[PDB]
A paper describes a structure:
Aldo-keto reductases (AKRs) are a superfamily of oxidoreductases capable of reducing carbonyl to primary and secondary alcohols, found in all phyla.
Beyond that, we also obtained a binary AKRtyl structure in complex with tylosin at 2.25 Å resolution. The overall construction of this structure is similar to the the first apo structure and all 16 subunits are in the cofactor-free state. However, the tylosin molecule is bound to each chain at the allosteric site consistent with that observed in the ternary complex structure. Intriguingly, each octamer in the structure has half dormant and half active conformation which are grouped into two tetramers, consistent with the aforementioned MWC allosteric model.
Residue numbers in the entry:
A (entry chain F): 1 to 229, 249 to 331
B (entry chain D): 1 to 227, 249 to 331
C (entry chain G): 1 to 21, 28 to 52, 59 to 89, 95 to 231, 248 to 331
D (entry chain C): 1 to 21, 29 to 52, 59 to 89, 95 to 230, 247 to 331
E (entry chain E): 1 to 21, 28 to 52, 60 to 87, 96 to 230, 249 to 331
The structure:
Amino acid sequence: MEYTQLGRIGLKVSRLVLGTMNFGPTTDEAESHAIMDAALDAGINFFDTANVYGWGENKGRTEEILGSWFAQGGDRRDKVVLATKVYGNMGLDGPAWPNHDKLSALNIRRSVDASLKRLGTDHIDLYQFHHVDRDTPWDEIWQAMDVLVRQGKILYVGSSNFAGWNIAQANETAARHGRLGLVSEQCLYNLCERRAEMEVVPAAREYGLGVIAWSPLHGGLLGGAIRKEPQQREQIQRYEDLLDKHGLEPGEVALAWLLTRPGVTGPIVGPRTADQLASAVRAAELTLTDEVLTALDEIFPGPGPSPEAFAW
Amino acid sequence: MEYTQLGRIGLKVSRLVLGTMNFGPTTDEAESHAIMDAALDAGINFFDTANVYGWGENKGRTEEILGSWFAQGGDRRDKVVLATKVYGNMGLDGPAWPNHDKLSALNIRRSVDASLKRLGTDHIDLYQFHHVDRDTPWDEIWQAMDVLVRQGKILYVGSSNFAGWNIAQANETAARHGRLGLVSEQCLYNLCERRAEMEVVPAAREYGLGVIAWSPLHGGLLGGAIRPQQREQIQRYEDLLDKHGLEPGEVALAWLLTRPGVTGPIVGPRTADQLASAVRAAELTLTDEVLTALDEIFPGPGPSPEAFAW
Amino acid sequence: MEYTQLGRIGLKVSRLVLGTMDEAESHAIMDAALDAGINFFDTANVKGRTEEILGSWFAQGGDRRDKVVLATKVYGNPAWPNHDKLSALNIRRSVDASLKRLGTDHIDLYQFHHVDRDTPWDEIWQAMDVLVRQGKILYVGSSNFAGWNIAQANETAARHGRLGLVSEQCLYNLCERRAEMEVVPAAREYGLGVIAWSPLHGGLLGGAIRKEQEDPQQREQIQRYEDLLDKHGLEPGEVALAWLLTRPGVTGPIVGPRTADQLASAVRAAELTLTDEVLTALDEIFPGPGPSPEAFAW
Amino acid sequence: MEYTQLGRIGLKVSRLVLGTMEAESHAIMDAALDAGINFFDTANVKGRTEEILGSWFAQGGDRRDKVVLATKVYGNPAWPNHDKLSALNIRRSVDASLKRLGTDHIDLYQFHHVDRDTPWDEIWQAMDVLVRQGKILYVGSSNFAGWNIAQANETAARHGRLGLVSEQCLYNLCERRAEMEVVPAAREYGLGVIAWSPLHGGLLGGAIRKEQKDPQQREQIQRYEDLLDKHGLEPGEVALAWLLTRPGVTGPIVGPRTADQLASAVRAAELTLTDEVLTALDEIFPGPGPSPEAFAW
Amino acid sequence: MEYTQLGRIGLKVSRLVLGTMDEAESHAIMDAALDAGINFFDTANVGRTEEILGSWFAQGGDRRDKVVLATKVYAWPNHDKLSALNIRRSVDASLKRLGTDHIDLYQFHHVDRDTPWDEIWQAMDVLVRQGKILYVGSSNFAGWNIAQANETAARHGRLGLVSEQCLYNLCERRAEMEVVPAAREYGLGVIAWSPLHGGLLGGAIRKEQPQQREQIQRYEDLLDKHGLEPGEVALAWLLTRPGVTGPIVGPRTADQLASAVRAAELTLTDEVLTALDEIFPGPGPSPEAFAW
Ligand SMILES: CC[C@H]1OC(=O)C[C@@H](O)[C@H](C)[C@@H](O[C@@H]2O[C@H](C)[C@@H](O[C@H]3C[C@@](C)(O)[C@@H](O)[C@H](C)O3)[C@H](N(C)C)[C@H]2O)[C@@H](CC=O)C[C@@H](C)C(=O)/C=C/C(C)=C\[C@@H]1CO[C@@H]1O[C@H](C)[C@@H](O)[C@@H](OC)[C@H]1OC
Ligand SMILES: CC[C@H]1OC(=O)C[C@@H](O)[C@H](C)[C@@H](O[C@@H]2O[C@H](C)[C@@H](O[C@H]3C[C@@](C)(O)[C@@H](O)[C@H](C)O3)[C@H](N(C)C)[C@H]2O)[C@@H](CC=O)C[C@@H](C)C(=O)/C=C\C(C)=C\[C@@H]1CO[C@@H]1O[C@H](C)[C@@H](O)[C@@H](OC)[C@H]1OC
Ligand SMILES: CC[C@H]1OC(=O)C[C@@H](O)[C@H](C)[C@@H](O[C@@H]2O[C@H](C)[C@@H](O[C@H]3C[C@@](C)(O)[C@@H](O)[C@H](C)O3)[C@H](N(C)C)[C@H]2O)[C@@H](CC=O)C[C@@H](C)C(=O)/C=C\C(C)=C\[C@@H]1CO[C@@H]1O[C@H](C)[C@@H](O)[C@@H](OC)[C@H]1OC
Ligand SMILES: CC[C@H]1OC(=O)C[C@@H](O)[C@H](C)[C@@H](O[C@@H]2O[C@H](C)[C@@H](O[C@H]3C[C@@](C)(O)[C@@H](O)[C@H](C)O3)[C@H](N(C)C)[C@H]2O)[C@@H](CC=O)C[C@@H](C)C(=O)/C=C\C(C)=C\[C@@H]1CO[C@@H]1O[C@H](C)[C@@H](O)[C@@H](OC)[C@H]1OC
Ligand SMILES: CC[C@H]1OC(=O)C[C@@H](O)[C@H](C)[C@@H](O[C@@H]2O[C@H](C)[C@@H](O[C@H]3C[C@@](C)(O)[C@@H](O)[C@H](C)O3)[C@H](N(C)C)[C@H]2O)[C@@H](CC=O)C[C@@H](C)C(=O)/C=C\C(C)=C\[C@@H]1CO[C@@H]1O[C@H](C)[C@@H](O)[C@@H](OC)[C@H]1OC
């Protein structure tokens, strides 16, 4: 297992991030636990979850499954860098009661308290915004997060689905008064969707955030979606054909590709079974030749950074 | 129900603020709870109280009435933005024991501890100065408030009965050391009394404070004389509202909801009927003719310096 | 002559400020204002031509420049964009024009003519700091601000080491006391000198009814004022000025004497002691609103 | 003429920016003055253009006093430090610009492009030297990313300095990707947005009828020209007028070579587009939306 | 010619830095250095030197505009060291001797432990703000002097040291303990003075015909097996070192220039690098260098 610093900070994490969104809705508790043990066994120390995982009327269930996993002891809590999120509506799906979603200090307080109860732990290592909230100013957000820091309830703060300028504004605001800023950004990033390269990833790299790629196979579409059974199909076909030609698995290459991108800490890997985890772990050891990198780049061009992306 | 951001911050509030001053002194606990459930049903999430509500020897009773409401469960606490106040004498009415009113860190400590006990909760969402205290510096006040923020005992700080320059001084002082300053001013504003517009509301807007109008009916006066220079003015008002078939109480509220910078008025119902009426005032549109008429009868000063100079 | 600190700063000024309004006639009161010990000269009308007349005054030598605290103002007054108001652009052009007309290399107190709510204080303080570091200006003052504008301005200045506004020139007199609600409280809090403009309310407090004989309610008021002073042996124009010199935070009124007789009258106004009984009755005739928020709430 | 604040600052500008893209230049600049345009930029829609402004100002008649003068860093294989935004390159470019313009100050000095190799403490040192000498009033950007505006202005504010007051970016019906992050950031930080190539190099200027490329781009332009035929609207005027409806936009740079093109740009600033016309332009020329919603959710 | 950012700043310099050791022949070698694409001129020895540069710019032809001009500071009290007093008199004399209105890189000649940084940055900021100096650099500092200096400048918004000139070559590698780590952390370019250790790595044992001589012998003998010139290799070695901007070279002739230029084009094999590292061990970073 390859390890790296999470951006500029002192925290070392596995290049694979274990996603947990399947634990609860699709994978049962006992199997989720076996996967998490398997993940530790493979050297994966970075586990990602969210208050809202579990979905609909079972929001919170995933956090509860990690809580029962820690409760078995055996140094599980101690070995893991635990990440969860705040922003989402935790009540009935649909329009939220005011201040029961988004990033007011009010929603942060109630969300973190509920997450700590479900996770059965006194601290979260990486507390992440699920999304930018353009209505909440950073002096409010940093007040909320600093209260939790100083109480020992969280260590690090991270972002998810931010724009590049939000990352800059957050970290400049934090730095003004000596606070550690965002340490990581979780953006949608994969061969199909490369527009994070325009500004989100450049900002992250400037400010020393780790970059965590969610949906690394683009919902499945890069995992061998055509062999399984618009003009997007021609790309995918050319993709599989190129990987047939070279003997490589689609699912594994989508992950290995992300590992070659500048600034990228690693992909979120969201296995349903211990078999799919072991595949992810192979993808991490895989080495991709400069020839196959050119090919994928030709099939899946990236925008490049702004302003060059749309101007010069 | 129309919602809005409280000034520049991420908190979203109903444009009606439920005032609780009647809960205890005139409306009773059981009925107060009735009204507060109806306010939730109406989409009102913003509840305003104060330690001194109750009046006389019953000061504190409103806070307790809120406390027993939260104790019923059903996510009542979790659904409200709870706001209370510090400054007032909580002992026997008349001259205060020193440091038992006003805004010394000493009075702030003892006031918040008693409010949290009565309210039956571990935190207040919005803790408001009831009035400006010009004898207490902002480095002292913000120390006291910052202690409460970091302990998780309050989230936001607001003001009430400030001058505009007090708003600027407070928030400039907070911003110097990276603190969130005042998020709202609760000022006396209505058709009769519009001198908040000279400097209070301009200042609040510059600094991104919510503006919450208290005494939106000027203590009943804008409610009815059906039941000397000023009698004449109110007469002209009630006659205008007879012409258009509009309730006086509803227009005074809806008018404040047209003012630039105004979050909304504090509505203080004695009864569930008075509440449903406030909700109706929130739904009212006022024609440009009615707005222009009210402005003639009840002129505003406009901003300083233009208000008295040019 | 009574002298005072201009607010919190180290500059000492006369409690009479010499405002404005022939050339050698102006030079003569100015020399006379000096001999009377008035050191604080302001180009505010009680623009371009007045500066030139000060300019020719200084050009005569005799330590005239060295002896005076020279205050001027952004020119102001349908204008071409940026030829009014307080952009860094307008400030640059107004100051350079003023220095050329005043025929001096520095202005002691450079003042804003009016609040401009479209220009942020980091822009304004940039423009002023350029001039301070070049030595073209010493102190910065306001005119026709709100209390909160004074607060914003001095807080912004103080964040980066800068001296803020040292003075505010506002309309303040027996007739118009609404400066007392917030402007003068803000000024007092931040250590600004308050310079009272139109101290006689455009002449209304200088004995305008007795000068008429040679609005219903306001006339009743002036009439009750002239009669109170008749009763007390006191010149109205002098009492208007003396009243202001009793008010908390007031540096002094602007006066525009054109003769030894008018200068001597302002000087006697500054030496005048109004009795508690006079002050009590003036307060009754011309009530102030008190500070906000007590002024309109409690 | 419609006037606006340049972003958050107190400087008032016309919503048309005269891109000076000698004798026929001088003529059009006087007509722009008389039309109430006070905002003159040396951005091409550099070298000679500045000299042409300099001889304009040397004619006198309060011309320098009446204009907001904006220029740019020159830019350009370059000799080291004769391109980009080192303090060394800024000194030499401004000194040469002041010489050519025959003026002792520039009102708005702009970066020509983001330089990723120069830290903002270096850039702000260079600009603060000039501001404190009086050679420059305001600073602006061109061809920046959203995060570069944020970084610039946070760095400036930290030590009390006025940051960027304006960004010049490529923005028109055809190219709307500035809306992802550049314009959002400019709006957050209170920069004026100045739209260069507002007709996308003539292409929105009725380019298919002046024939009297890619198949899909031509299809798009065709519907545009047909929509405006239907409504009786000049395509050149509409491209400009659409930019004036966009949140955050101060205005477009125009390079009128004739009284006719000037008068046209002036009419565009007075034109009101109906909601139906706005809906239809939007359908033909869709914007990406703000990031992250533009590519995520 | 190879170019690099000077540390973290936006200034681009040649990886060879032209130092100095009559008049029209200095002028001619400077012209030749431009033609080879060297833009970085330093008055440091590898008064009169500044005057020679002055007459060079006085010829015109965009000579001043094409070069990054670096000079340095420098006993009667305050006529040495880094007092605001000596800085002022030294820079005034430099600008006159150099016949220019600005210096691109103004460098301290040595650490002065008796002057605080608030006094030094006052003096530098005055000059930066009058336009007389762009960038500030150090020479012969400790690592902690670099940290203190740049932390002090950052406090009040000011650009700190952009470069350190230290004694660094195969023979003297102790700058690697802390000076070069500090410079790397703070984003200073590292300029290697005496890159040939006074000519000891320039083929000295051949030129003549204790246990230091043993070292130089294994060096010269290794460079015979590979068909490499010692002069060139000591330069190329430094160019492979982390944090190094480049060496100060003082060519007097077109012939030595061309040697310097070749040494910047040269690529040493990992075999050669490994062998140089064996003959000339470095201490590593503190605290590992002396503890663990
Ligand atoms: C002590 C001496 C007397 O008292 C005064 O002379 C005080 C008056 O000057 C007040 C303030 C005036 O009222 C003021 O008139 C100004 C023109 C307004 O100023 C305006 C214009 C502005 C530019 O100044 C601006 O800044 C400001 C905000 O608005 C101002 N405003 C605040 C509204 C307003 O208070 C007048 C209007 C005319 O002058 C109001 C009327 C009803 C009046 O005569 C009242 C008299 C009273 C109560 C007492 C006695 C005599 O009153 C006697 O009281 C005894 C008990 C009996 O003898 C009585 O007889 C039966 C009676 O005799 C007459
Ligand atoms: C390996 C070389 C091949 O090159 C490619 O396969 C590259 C293509 O995949 C490009 C990028 C596609 O064009 C992309 O189509 C996506 C659906 C869009 O993505 C969408 C969806 C989104 C979610 O991704 C979003 O983020 C994005 C912004 O918009 C995307 N956009 C950035 C606009 C757009 O570039 C396709 C559209 C369909 O697939 C465009 C068509 C006209 C095309 O074939 C063009 C050129 C070339 C030279 C093809 C050769 C084949 O030619 C021959 O193919 C043989 C198989 C080889 O062996 C060679 O023969 C020896 C070779 O010869 C040259
Ligand atoms: C729109 C219809 C009428 O207009 C109004 O009714 C407006 C009035 O309400 C004004 C403002 C009042 O004057 C206010 O009296 C308040 C008690 C003061 O409030 C006090 C107390 C406070 C608590 O509010 C405090 O906050 C404040 C600062 O001070 C307040 N102050 C700001 C000074 C002061 O403006 C009244 C006093 C009594 O109401 C003054 C009297 C002499 C008056 O009527 C004068 C002029 C005009 C032009 C009247 C028209 C025409 O009247 C007729 O209207 C018909 C519709 C037409 O067809 C015409 O008929 C022919 C026309 O007649 C020509
Ligand atoms: C007004 C309604 C019409 O809708 C439009 O005309 C919308 C089109 O203009 C879209 C956006 C174009 O697609 C764009 O093609 C550009 C070349 C790309 O731009 C490029 C270049 C760039 C420089 O812009 C760059 O910045 C950008 C990122 O990529 C751009 N990209 C953002 C991906 C891409 O959206 C076209 C391709 C060319 O015109 C795509 C094709 C398949 C298409 O027609 C699809 C759907 C519809 C529903 C058309 C109707 C016609 O149908 C009927 O047409 C009648 C005339 C109407 O009146 C209606 O009748 C009622 C209507 O019926 C509903
Ligand atoms: C490739 C392998 C070769 O390895 C070297 O040649 C490495 C040597 O250069 C080391 C480092 C020297 O030791 C250094 O001697 C300098 C004068 C000191 O420098 C001084 C002065 C300063 C100014 O530099 C200062 O900065 C510094 C701190 O202190 C320095 N210091 C760090 C203390 C000190 O390490 C020598 C002294 C002379 O050269 C010390 C003695 C005990 C010695 O001969 C040891 C080993 C040898 C001979 C190994 C062979 C060569 O010898 C044969 O080479 C053949 C090619 C092969 O067959 C080999 O087979 C393995 C072998 O055979 C026997």
